[PDB]
Write a protein that binds this ligand. Structure first.
Ligand SMILES: O=C(O)C[C@@](O)(CF)CCOP(=O)(O)OP(=O)(O)O
Ligand SMILES: O=C(O)C[C@@](O)(CF)CCOP(=O)(O)OP(=O)(O)O
Lengths: 321, 328
């Protein structure tokens, strides 16, 4: 019997990953830039037993649905292949996330699993190969191998497509992300758009410049500059969905109300910037020093229970005991 | 009806139009000069009838809308517009304006294009200004940009120009193609069009993108019309309409006119399209989805929407060939 346990934190893309060059190995049309969150994470124990017939997944104490179970059994086949064994595993996982708030991620799930399998089967995988392993489950999991700022380099094959951590001289310790809590999966949404969106080329033509400008801002620890490019990049992502055949949107009116509050804060000498993912939740990057002030502005309009802050964590994926 | 010797009245009926290539954002806010050309179709079903009566006794302009007094705000608005008319006609006469909107305004359809075209034409008739169509378009434009196109029937294009003299629309001869087409309206506090286009135009991060493709879209559409190629016209206009709404997403801060139900209707259009009912949608300053379809398939497409939308919510109109007309 072989076993290991790890904690992986979710991460939010500032420069978005959106569209796969390759659906089976999960290679992206473009690089992406994320920050890892202190507050939301997944803890996953994996246990390999010669007696097991088929992989079992218990999440938060309950069993998973067809699609996940299947999704997990295909992923574990990849693990088996890599390990060179034929062992099925009982997986017990726990999401540390505000309940039923749309904030559970494949990113934390798969990074945690990859690192737990790594530990269980003693593979001593390099961070690079761990990221690659996580990428095969969910693209954004590639980045949750790392803390702080991370970049997923798209590469062109299974070997070259992986994330790496970015040193910002501890800039991440100065930043925070406020969540405003407010259904098409990212996988399905993004493939429709990657395949059919009339505005997809426009996305591809600007993503690299945004990326470079984002990465440059990080080197200089220049918040306003980072803020503006990621905000624009973010909106361009949702634009591409408007061009889809047929169009769709992740956003609802409340999402826009939150956006408007972010703009006012800037006008009130409280710099912050928003982004949205595959849902209407609005995420607000802000400096720690201004975090409380910005939150107060939201509390005027949103319920206290819906305004949830998190720090950016510096460390990466972590084996547990 | 009967009019005293020293009173000049005129009454006109102008039809609403829907932009297939969108006007969105002004170069000049005071004279209403657009940042780009637009192209539209004039709808047979929806129109405004406006009567105007000039009387030397009248001390100020009066506006009666669908039988009721307008408030002081809209009153003040209409008096400033009529000043333009007075300046043009070289008089100082005031008028009583009796207008009736036969447009589903409560349902969200815009009345601004027909209202201002009707008013312009009505005045030209009352005062005998002998205005050319070009000059009628220019006068309607001062009131609302889209109004410049409602002077004309069928397909019409607003040439943007660079000043008050050069910015106006004309009718496009389509060899009668307008007679084969129809538009279906799926009916679903609004930022005004004027207000909305201004925020996007001034601040939108994606506005340049709009500007970089509008002329190409327009040429493709116009070439589509010359060819009477419904697919070619439909694809470019659908994309154009979507790009306009995209710009709004890039505004500071963003907004949208679309709701989930709008998206639902679009889905049904694409469905009809995959099922050999060719049609294409567009949206203006609100959630209503408008569906361009050939008159033959109108009935079929409607039924598909009727599978999910309330019968009262689905309303078709043909496209009318004639332009603004004076009436009794
Ligand atoms: O995370 C980002 O960069 C952007 C998004 O969050 C925005 F919605 C997408 C997440 O993608 P994911 O769930 O990883 O897709 P998968 O590869 O199909 O599993
Ligand atoms: O009609 C189109 O080209 C597209 C739109 O309808 C989309 F919302 C804009 C209409 O603008 P309008 O009411 O004419 O503005 P005004 O000049 O400020 O009065």
């Amino acid at each position: 019997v072989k076993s290991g346990k790890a904690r992986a934190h979710t991460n939010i893309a500032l420069i978005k990953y959106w569209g796969k060059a390759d659906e089976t190995y999960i290679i992206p049309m473009n690089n992406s830039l994320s920050v890892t969150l202190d507050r939301f994470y997944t803890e996953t124990k994996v246990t390999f037993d010669p007696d097991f017939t088929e992989d079992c997944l218990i999440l938060n104490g309950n069993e998973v649905n067809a699609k996940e179970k299947e999704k997990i059994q295909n992923y574990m086949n990849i693990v088996r292949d890599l390990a060179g064994n034929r062992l099925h595993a009982r997986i017990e996982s726990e999401n540390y996330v505000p309940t039923a708030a749309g904030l559970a991620s494949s990113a934390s799930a798969y990074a945690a699993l990859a690192a737990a399998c790594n530990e269980a089967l003693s593979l001593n995988l390099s961070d690079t190969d761990l990221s690659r392993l996580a990428r095969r489950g969910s693209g954004s999991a590639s980045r949750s191998i790392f803390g702080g700022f991370a970049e997923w380099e798209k590469g062109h094959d299974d070997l070259t497509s992986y994330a790496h951590g970015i040193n910002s001289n501890g800039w991440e310790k100065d930043l925070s992300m406020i969540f405003v809590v407010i259904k098409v999966s990212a996988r399905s949404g993004m493939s429709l758009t990657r395949d059919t969106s009339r505005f997809y080329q426009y996305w591809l033509d600007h993503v690299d410049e945004d990326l470079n400008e984002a990465k440059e801002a990080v080197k200089n620890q220049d918040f306003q500059r980072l803020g503006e490019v990621i905000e624009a990049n973010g909106l361009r992502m949702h634009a591409t969905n408007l061009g889809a055949q047929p169009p769709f949107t992740y956003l609802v009116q409340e999402s826009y109300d939150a956006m408007a509050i972010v703009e006012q804060c800037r006008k009130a000498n409280l710099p912050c910037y928003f982004t949205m993912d595959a849902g209407p939740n609005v995420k607000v990057l802000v400096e720690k020093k201004n975090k409380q002030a910005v939150m107060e502005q939201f509390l005027k309009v949103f319920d206290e229970s819906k305004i949830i802050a998190s720090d950016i964590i510096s460390s990466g994926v972590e084996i547990i005991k």
